[PDB]
Design a protein around this motif. Structure first.
Motif, PDB file in Angstrom:
ATOM      1  N   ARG A  11      -7.955  10.832  -4.054  1.00 16.91           N
ATOM      2  CA  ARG A  11      -7.044  10.419  -5.125  1.00 16.91           C
ATOM      3  C   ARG A  11      -7.192  11.263  -6.389  1.00 16.91           C
TER       4      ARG A  11
ATOM      5  N   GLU B 123      -1.677   3.398  -0.387  1.00 19.37           N
ATOM      6  CA  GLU B 123      -0.421   3.399  -1.119  1.00 19.37           C
ATOM      7  C   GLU B 123       0.497   4.502  -0.618  1.00 19.37           C
ATOM      8  N   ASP B 124       1.277   4.161   0.409  1.00 19.23           N
ATOM      9  CA  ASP B 124       2.335   5.016   0.940  1.00 19.23           C
ATOM     10  C   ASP B 124       2.932   4.432   2.222  1.00 19.23           C
ATOM     11  N   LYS B 125       3.895   5.146   2.805  1.00 19.68           N
ATOM     12  CA  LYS B 125       4.540   4.739   4.047  1.00 19.68           C
ATOM     13  C   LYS B 125       5.401   3.534   3.742  1.00 19.68           C
ATOM     14  N   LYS B 126       6.368   3.168   4.595  1.00 19.37           N
ATOM     15  CA  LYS B 126       6.930   3.944   5.723  1.00 19.37           C
ATOM     16  C   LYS B 126       6.117   4.116   7.043  1.00 19.37           C
TER      17      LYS B 126
ATOM     18  N   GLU C 192      -5.339  14.479  -5.949  1.00 19.57           N
ATOM     19  CA  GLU C 192      -3.889  14.357  -6.104  1.00 19.57           C
ATOM     20  C   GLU C 192      -3.508  14.336  -7.572  1.00 19.57           C
TER      21      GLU C 192
END
Lengths: 227, 157, 124, 365, 122
Positions: free
Chosen positions: E114, B68-71, E117
RNA sequence: AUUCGGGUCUUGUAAUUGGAAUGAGUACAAUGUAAAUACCUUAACGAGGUUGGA
């Protein structure tokens, strides 16, 4: 059984009934153990078995730490004292002369540190956040060794900040680098390199960098001198 | 040499996943064009950067992609190679109990057994996505996978 | 070659002074060139010794310096900037065979191949 | 095939006639009613299947016949149950009642003699039967199972037709009407899925909305969902779901998100919401009934524009854990299986008025 | 519940239960609160999994404290029945531990990162 | 890389277990050269043996 001194002050090795070699320290409070460790009498003096799998310092020694800056009568600031496992061993090493200032911000755990620190005049427990050295500024003095084992992503920065408050010029810092609590995504080995650079880009002189494997996965300890 | 120690690396991946060749070559090139064309972001938000965006980003993937990220999917060029590898049954089908250990796996993948929720899948290098259905199917029956279901706690990654 | 690997994105690449000059006076995008060939995020750096050497070159050949002092390459603060670029990189990579080296110094490359696990890059 | 029954406003709910009938069994898990003389069938963790005559709305359900399974039946093609029966469905033709549960078997019994006429195993070591639903006016049966599959059957062929794949957790509940299609819910996958059997396609609807995100988009002017547990189809184009955060959601086949949500529909009791443990939309009408363990059966009315629903009333004699709800008509009779435990073994702290038996409510107009 | 230190979203909770199942198959797990304890005390555990519906809460209350001393990461799931049934048991379990991840290394490493974070960190 | 130090520790059974592994034949109609239509796709019935270095 046989117990004998090592290259480092107040740190001993045992020959055993079977032929095994384990680290131990000279028991400051005889008849009393902090975790489950074995108590051992030899020539009427009692020693506390120093399990390397629990204590990172014992680990670092068994991985060949050149010279240990913790000895008789040393003053240490211990960031992340937790339940008191390792700090009890540095209390044994340091003896009544020296002093250990244990900073720890988890109450659930300082609970058990209290018990360790009651029995031991060496250790001065502190329930405070190592991110704010102002909140214990008024109890501690400057020190020879900054021993830093805290689970925080910016652990290194925290350590440097405490250093410029409390670490004596030419004092030593043992810094434990926890790869997986800085970033579980990054490679442990990339982390060790970039954190050491933070110490160097301050002004710490990297003396030795140990990998704590077998004993601690994804961990490395750095020894360096503050200028 | 770097050539040499490379020809090491590859053999490392050679069961860091399970292959036996240069499918490491397959996935490799992939990673190239993925990056490549991708890395050719460049650029702005050209309504193109747009479609291509959630586009290649919809690389995800299940068992596949990132998390879950990017770009910035060049991360993949790091991963992909070292990630795109897993995902597929070639990997993410030992890491699910059934398979006793990669080898003891591809063999059923082939050898009729091992099927993705209806229909086998001999193509012993498919790809996984929404996996919870990667059972045996079997249709006396697929033996090696039907009783050795020690996967009844295969809560893995 | 018996070398255990543990390299992870972003690659750390030391760029030497010759490569910097070269890419400058031939207009080669060094940053994108490395991301292209390494196919992953790269942190591109230059030792203080390399950039110092550039600084001298910069007295009559303006242009390498600015690119070389760019954030793209981030400075690696070595303890010995006074040592030829070549020896600087060698003594920095000898303890950190981790970092990739991009150099036009075929002499520096030869003696780095000795060290296991050192990706080597250069411009034809 | 749409909603045409508008009797929601007519219902004399406040003056409903309420009764309860104790059973000597432990933990009814499901109740199935037959409607052309009306019948009800109950199943229990105690391995008992029981048949009731419910045609006389003036008197409580009349026990006719029972069949009990047990350890004798350990193999799985024996004609008896040996592990918890989780679900029961009466065939629309009046001829069959089929049961299923943790022993990975479908058993189809004749309604005449309450005797097993066919046993159809799922053939999977994880294929526990969790829910049954006949296509209305058909012999086509749909069984949602614990191995993430939905199995279909032709009951007068006593055979398995096919298997449907899509869910990523146990398929807790399944609902069907007259069309050759069904809705399923996947519990922790937080999806509902609409299966169009003849078209070989399927729609997917997603819940599991982050509360911080929901609050964030609500500020443009609650409770975490971890499982979507129950489902009921209101017509061929709409359905309702119930979650373990108390949410009752109305969905249209055309929309990706729920068209309407009633949050914590059964209230709370730092804060814990009551799960929705039962949900029954009477087919093609504007009324549906919901149940939990909060002490009452909530009856709701859907808007004529199908964009919302509203609380019609409460049936407050319904203490215990409601495990299944059915509605029969002649006058509406609501039947609900009440247990001390959740059907599937989810743990429930203090159920007030915990008990074992059948709740009945008769509502006029 | 009060022994729960932080918030675990259901996607993560499911990725944990998965991680455990693959670890039964291909690695080594410990199941049950006492065995989990010993695994922490001995420093063997890489990840500790605690259920949220333990019924006297205090049964697992010592684990957060213990894991922090030994610097072993821990995570929550919502059902104890679900964790035990993952574990390869037909009964509930209050807490479990992964000693060797095997074919879940990648899956575990994502979890332990995770939970970093949503704990603070960087 | 070792020169000596170091690392630490399974490794051989030319030992004893695993399924009714599987392959190959047999109706098998056939999308099917209405004949290729048994060769397809089934289905099954049956059924595991480069280099360098003495």
């Amino acid at each position: 059984i046989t117990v004998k001194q090592t290259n480092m002050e107040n740190i001993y090795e045992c020959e055993f009934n079977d032929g095994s070699f384990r680290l131990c320290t000279r028991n400051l409070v005889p008849n009393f153990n902090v975790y489950g460790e074995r108590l051992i009498k030899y020539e009427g003096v009692e020693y506390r078995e120093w399990n390397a799998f629990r204590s990172k310092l014992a680990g670092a020694i068994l991985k060949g730490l050149k010279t240990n800056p913790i000895r008789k009568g040393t003053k240490v600031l211990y960031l992340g004292a937790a339940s008191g496992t390792t700090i009890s061993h540095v209390s044994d090493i340091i003896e009544l002369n020296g002093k250990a200032y244990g900073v720890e911000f988890s109450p659930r755990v300082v609970r058990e540190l209290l018990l360790v620190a009651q029995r031991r005049p060496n250790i001065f427990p502190l329930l405070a956040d190592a991110r704010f050295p102002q909140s214990y500024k008024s109890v501690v003095e400057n020190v020879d060794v900054l021993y830093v084992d805290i689970a925080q992503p910016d652990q290194t920065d925290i350590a440097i900040y405490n250093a410029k408050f409390f670490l004596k010029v030419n004092g030593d810092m043992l810094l434990v680098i926890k790869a997986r609590s800085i970033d579980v995504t990054k490679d442990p080995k990339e982390i060790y390199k970039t954190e050491v650079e933070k110490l160097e880009n301050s002004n710490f002189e990297t003396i030795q960098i140990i990998n704590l494997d077998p004993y601690d996965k994804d961990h490395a300890i750095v020894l360096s001198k503050y200028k | 040499s770097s050539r040499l120690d490379a020809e090491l690396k590859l053999a490392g991946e050679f069961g860091l996943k399970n292959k036996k060749e240069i499918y490491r070559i397959s996935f490799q090139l992939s990673k190239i064009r993925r990056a490549a064309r991708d890395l050719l972001t460049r650029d702005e938000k050209d309504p193109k950067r747009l479609f291509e965006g959630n586009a290649l980003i919809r690389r995800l993937v299940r068992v596949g992609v990132l998390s879950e990220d990017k770009k910035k999917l060049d991360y993949v060029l790091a991963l992909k190679v070292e990630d795109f590898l897993e995902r597929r049954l070639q990997t993410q089908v030992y890491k699910l109990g059934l398979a006793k250990s990669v080898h003891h796996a591809r063999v059923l993948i082939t050898q009729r057994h091992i099927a993705v929720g209806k229909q086998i899948v001999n193509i012993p290098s498919f790809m996984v996505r929404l996996d919870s259905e990667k059972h045996i199917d079997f249709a006396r029956p697929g033996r090696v996978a039907r009783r050795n279901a020690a996967r009844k706690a295969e809560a893995s990654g | 070659f018996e070398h255990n690997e543990a390299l992870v994105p972003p690659y750390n690449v030391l760029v030497d002074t010759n490569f910097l000059s070269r890419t400058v006076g031939a207009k080669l995008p060094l940053l994108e060139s490395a991301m292209d060939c390494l196919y992953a995020s790269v942190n591109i750096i230059i030792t203080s010794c390399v950039m110092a050497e550039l600084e001298k070159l910069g007295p009559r050949y303006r242009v390498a310096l600015m690119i070389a002092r760019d954030e793209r390459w981030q400075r690696l603060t070595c303890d010995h900037k006074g040592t030829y670029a070549d020896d600087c990189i060698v003594d920095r990579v000898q303890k950190h065979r981790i970092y990739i080296v991009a150099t036009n110094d075929r002499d520096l490359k030869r003696r780095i191949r000795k060290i296991p696990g050192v990706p080597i890059m250069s411009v034809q | 095939g749409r909603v045409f029954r508008y009797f929601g406003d007519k219902l004399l709910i406040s003056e409903a006639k309420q009764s309860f009938t104790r059973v000597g069994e432990n933990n009814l898990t499901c109740i199935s009613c037959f409607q052309p003389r009306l019948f009800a069938y109950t199943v229990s963790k105690d391995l008992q299947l029981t048949k009731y005559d419910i045609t006389d709305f003036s008197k409580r359900p009349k026990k006719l016949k029972y069949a009990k399974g047990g350890a004798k039946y350990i193999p799985n093609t024996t004609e008896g149950h040996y592990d918890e029966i989780l679900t029961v469905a009466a065939s629309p033709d009046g001829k069959y009642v089929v049961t299923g549960g943790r022993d990975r078997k479908l058993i189809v019994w004749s309604t005449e003699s309450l005797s097993p006429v066919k046993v159809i195993p799922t053939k999977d070591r994880r294929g526990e039967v969790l829910s049954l639903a006949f296509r209305k006016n058909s012999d086509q049966l749909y069984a949602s199972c614990a191995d993430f599959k939905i199995r279909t059957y032709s009951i007068n062929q006593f055979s398995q037709l096919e298997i449907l794949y899509g869910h990523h957790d146990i398929v807790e509940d399944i609902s069907a009407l007259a069309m050759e299609r069904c809705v399923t819910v996947g519990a922790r996958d937080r999806t509902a899925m609409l299966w169009k059997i003849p078209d070989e396609t399927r729609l997917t609807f997603r819940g599991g909305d982050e509360p911080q995100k929901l609050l964030r988009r609500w500020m443009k002017e609650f409770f975490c969902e971890g499982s979507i547990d129950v489902v009921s189809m209101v017509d061929d184009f709409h359905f309702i779901t119930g979650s373990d955060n108390g949410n009752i959601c109305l969905w249209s086949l055309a929309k990706k998100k729920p068209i309407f949500t009633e949050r914590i529909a059964h209230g709370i009791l730092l804060l814990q919401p009551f799960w929705i443990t039962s949900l029954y939309a009477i087919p093609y009408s504007n009324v549906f009934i919901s149940g939990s363990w909060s002490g009452s059966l909530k009856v709701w009315k859907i808007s004529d524009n199908l964009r919302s629903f509203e609380l019609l009333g409460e049936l407050s004699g319904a203490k215990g854990v409601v495990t299944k709800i059915q509605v029969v008509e002649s006058k509406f009779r609501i039947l609900a299986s009440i247990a001390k435990e959740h059907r599937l073994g989810r743990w429930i702290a203090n159920v007030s008025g915990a008990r074992n038996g059948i709740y009945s409510a008769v509502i006029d107009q | 519940a009060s022994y729960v230190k932080f918030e675990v979203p259901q996607d993560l909770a499911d990725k944990v239960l998965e991680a455990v199942r693959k670890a039964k198959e291909s690695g080594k797990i410990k199941k049950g609160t006492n065995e989990t304890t010993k695994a922490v005390e001995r420093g063997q555990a890489k990840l500790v999994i605690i259920a949220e519906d333990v019924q006297p809460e205090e049964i697992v209350a010592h684990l957060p404290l213990l894991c922090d001393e030994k610097k072993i990461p821990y995570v929550y799931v919502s059902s104890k029945k679900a964790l035990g049934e993952a574990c390869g048991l037909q009964v509930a379990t209050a807490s479990a531990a992964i000693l060797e991840p095997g074919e879940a290394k990648d899956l575990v490493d994502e979890i332990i990162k995770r939970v970093n974070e949503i704990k603070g960190k960087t």
